[PDB]
Design a protein around this ligand. Sequence first.
Ligand SMILES: CC(C)(O)c1coc(S(=O)(=O)NC(=O)Nc2c3c(cc4c2CCC4)C=CC3)c1
Ligand SMILES: Nc1ncnc2c1ncn2[C@@H]1O[C@H](COP(=O)(O)OP(=O)(O)O)[C@@H](O)[C@H]1O
Lengths: 789, 311
Amino acid sequence: DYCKMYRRHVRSRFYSISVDLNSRYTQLQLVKESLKLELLFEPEDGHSEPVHTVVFQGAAGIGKTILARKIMLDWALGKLFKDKFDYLFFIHCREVSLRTPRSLADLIVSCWPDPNPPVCKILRKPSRILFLMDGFDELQGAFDEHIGEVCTDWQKAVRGDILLSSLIRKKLLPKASLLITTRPVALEKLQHLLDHPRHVEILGFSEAKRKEYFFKYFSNELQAREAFRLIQENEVLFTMCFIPLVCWIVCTGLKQQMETGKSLAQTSKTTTAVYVFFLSSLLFSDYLQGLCSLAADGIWNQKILFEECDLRKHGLQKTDVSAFLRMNRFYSFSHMTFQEFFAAMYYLLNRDVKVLLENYGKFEKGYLIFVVRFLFGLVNQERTSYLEKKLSCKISQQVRLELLKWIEVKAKAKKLQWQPSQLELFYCLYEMQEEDFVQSAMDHFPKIEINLSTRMDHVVSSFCIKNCHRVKTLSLGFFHTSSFCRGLFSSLSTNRSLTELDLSDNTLGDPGMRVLCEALQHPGCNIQRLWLGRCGLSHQCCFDISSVLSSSQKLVELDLSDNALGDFGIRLLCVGLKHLLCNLQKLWLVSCCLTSACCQDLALVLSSNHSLTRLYIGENALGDSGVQVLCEKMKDPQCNLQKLGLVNSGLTSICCSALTSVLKTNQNFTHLYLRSNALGDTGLRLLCEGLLHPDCKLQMLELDNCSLTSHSCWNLSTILTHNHSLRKLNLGNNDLGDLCVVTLCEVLKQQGCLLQSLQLGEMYLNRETKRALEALQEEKPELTIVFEI
Amino acid sequence: FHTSSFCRGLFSSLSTNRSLTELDLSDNTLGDPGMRVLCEALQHPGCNIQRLWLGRCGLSHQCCFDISSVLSSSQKLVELDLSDNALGDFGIRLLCVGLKHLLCNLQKLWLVSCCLTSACCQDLALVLSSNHSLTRLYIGENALGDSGVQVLCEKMKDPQCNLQKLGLVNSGLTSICCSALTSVLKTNQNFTHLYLRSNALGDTGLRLLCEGLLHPDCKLQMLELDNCSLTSHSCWNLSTILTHNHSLRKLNLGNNDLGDLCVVTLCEVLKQQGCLLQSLQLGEMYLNRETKRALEALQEEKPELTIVFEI
Ligand SMILES: CC(C)(O)c1coc(S(=O)(=O)NC(=O)Nc2c3c(cc4c2CCC4)C=CC3)c1
Ligand SMILES: Nc1ncnc2c1ncn2[C@@H]1O[C@H](COP(=O)(O)OP(=O)(O)O)[C@@H](O)[C@H]1O
């Protein structure tokens, strides 16, 4: 059969990567943004748009190419896509040059062993055909201008980029399958070309998978066990080994060490500089210059399949082929990271460094930063000296100052979208490992925002913020953590500059919140502000937070919105709040799944803590009973509460009498919110009962969506005519009628009203009403209106 | 609520009424012949009506001839409404004859949703150079387009033009007419207000408006941009407008995805005392907690600068 012979041929091609593939292969961890490899293309939901558009993301050396070759070999061995698919094809960006227009026939002929495939027979059922695009970072060189060029003929010879762009949007063989493996850097535009794709990220080895990989690498079990033990000797190296490429490099280095008699613990002692130490252990200035210039010209030209002319220009000769390079004549680097490393080393042995600084972005997915990363690696004073004394060369030093200036350029720029993320900057600053320069070039980050998804991220963040000395606002993202939280927040207590800490929407969980709590109550921490919205906490964290409040006198405000604390959680918090050393001022408790029962406890807080100015207990099933319980204790003039809020509390007019008492008595209760409460006109009249009081101080009174009516409208007129202190108001979603609006207008006309804002959003008024509102805006422009819906 | 005889019998006395000043007839389907009857009722010298609203009356181009005669014969009428009547470009061509008359004292003219096109715009231009009493025009919700707006503006750039509060709500414009609007802002010294909602101006259009907004001779006292389908790329231009325009005192940005960075930059720009803005709206978008804190702060230290950030 044709499929059997083609599968045998691709098995022959993909048997090795030399070194055998499957024997050295080890499983990886992948999660859809764990998704099993055998569970790839079936739709989890029965209404999935074509499953044929799946995109893959991963780091450099994560195993996208190895995953592609492994799935191809499985399809060549009778494992996967036998009863489901029939044909699998391989397309590579490096081989498919964008300058030469081609067709799908060319790709099939290249993939087929026979230069004369049955093209007529194999282009009838695209369902059982899957096209693979590996290394997508070499395709969008002209997608930004070729949006409208569409080709749908399989036999038509059109530029490779245009043809693949046509393939992506499912119009050339629309029912065929596609599998694209990409770097995650520059997907922002590609998702526009994608028709309901599935983004799957690759995370690499776990601990057991790492041990399996060392077993499958070394031919000696004892040597593999010693390598494993020395990997756990260095925690940093063990964390770095989640990338299979680093495992390969360290295994080869340990092989070279033990065969030559060198000790293996030296490899473990070497951190963050695996590539440089590996190169030094493996091993002339003309050779280095030629190879470095070859890598640099490949960088500019996006060329990997070098020919003789490049080596002629760079002075490289036939005797200049080594292990890093590979001859196929075709010259190609074994893995790209090596050529970025050589290009980075070039600029320290066009030599103008500014090409790296500003010509970034000309290549999709940012080849340069990785390059520049090793630049920060090499410019390290100890590493620079070691490079000079190991290769007898000299390293330029103005490059460090230029890179510093680039650091401030990146930090202080405005159009921050095009630049790569700040986590890349922190990777660089961890790579270089120069304390004074890190501190000096890092004092330019008053506000730090980072999103963490692996052990390496946690380690680099720990180092970076530990180096920080002048940071004020800090945010974190645990995008998937007791050990993680400990490792990060241990340094935060020692940080004497931090003042605001954002952790909203992170599912750090309850034990992580506990870890944060014992981190905070250390006397060194200077955090005055802590936001914890939607953290997924519960009543357990309230005990720890209460301890923090009773022990810390620097914290000012605090947020706990949308955590199911409950009335028991509030009961736990009030113990800390009532403590005489609590300096809390603003306390959010929105949507904390509360009930009226907690309200009583809250009352004691208002008579035990005087620093609490504004409370926000909206969106809870408090009710009239709870509001009355709060108000009854709140009527004391000594109570210092200012800006209470009861948004969507399900109240009624019953609590309005208590609110009236509060307004009549308290002299500091300025603001007040009541939206989404069925107060009614009786409730508004009851509020008016206290609003007219000469001792009132209410400086705003929101009533949006209170389900009001025009019966208490005279009360509105009275409030405006007599309240000389109220300066804002809201009436959204209240059917008051045209007569009420015009009476409001005529009341506002006089100079005795000091109102400075009013909203009539979202209702249908009249033409006469609109004229009256325009007039009142005309003669008095200070009194703003938002009447327009 | 169900009229030639009816209209005659009623409006015969209205001409003799020496006290009436405003006459509302919105939503009445009095038809076109009834509107004619009203017209011969009005142009009697005794009538003192200064205000006539005719929204959704179901009129057509036929009534425009009679209304033009009324305008050319009456010197007491001040404003006039014709919203949601299918007048058409021919109806506007008929009206402009009366409007261009030297005895027309019209000040406010609504023409919202009059089924117009760009062709009428040229005629309207002559009005602005023939009638100086016309202060505010409202020609929104029509398929005018960039060509029509350019035709209006090209004649509108004269500093002698007395138009103040033009409006182009939902006119289907684009950034092309923004250069003409920039010229208007650069030249005219009385064009205070201006509406542009529901127009796909874009960030390029906002930059083009900023080109004339920054002019020291500007006088624009409000600039609505709600639902203009904006973005954060021209955001520096927003900062520049607030930092340099000392006359603008209102603004609208509803239904514009500007992003958190833009909102916080807006905040920090507004912080300084060099900004005289007295209102701003950020209705109907999803902001951030830090954004909300910044907005609450700017409301705290300076209470005069109102914000409607809450959706
Ligand atoms: C921000 C984000 C998600 O980490 C990212 C964005 O872009 C990339 S990547 O595609 O540049 N890959 C890499 O940097 N891999 C990589 C890493 C380390 C060490 C090495 C490599 C490559 C060889 C040595 C240590 C952590 C990652 C990653
Ligand atoms: N599944 C795997 N099993 C064993 N080694 C792997 C695996 N994936 C990657 N590697 C290691 O990574 C190297 C190849 O990296 P590659 O897959 O080309 O990275 P990328 O896919 O990011 O280009 C090989 O030397 C190999 O040792």
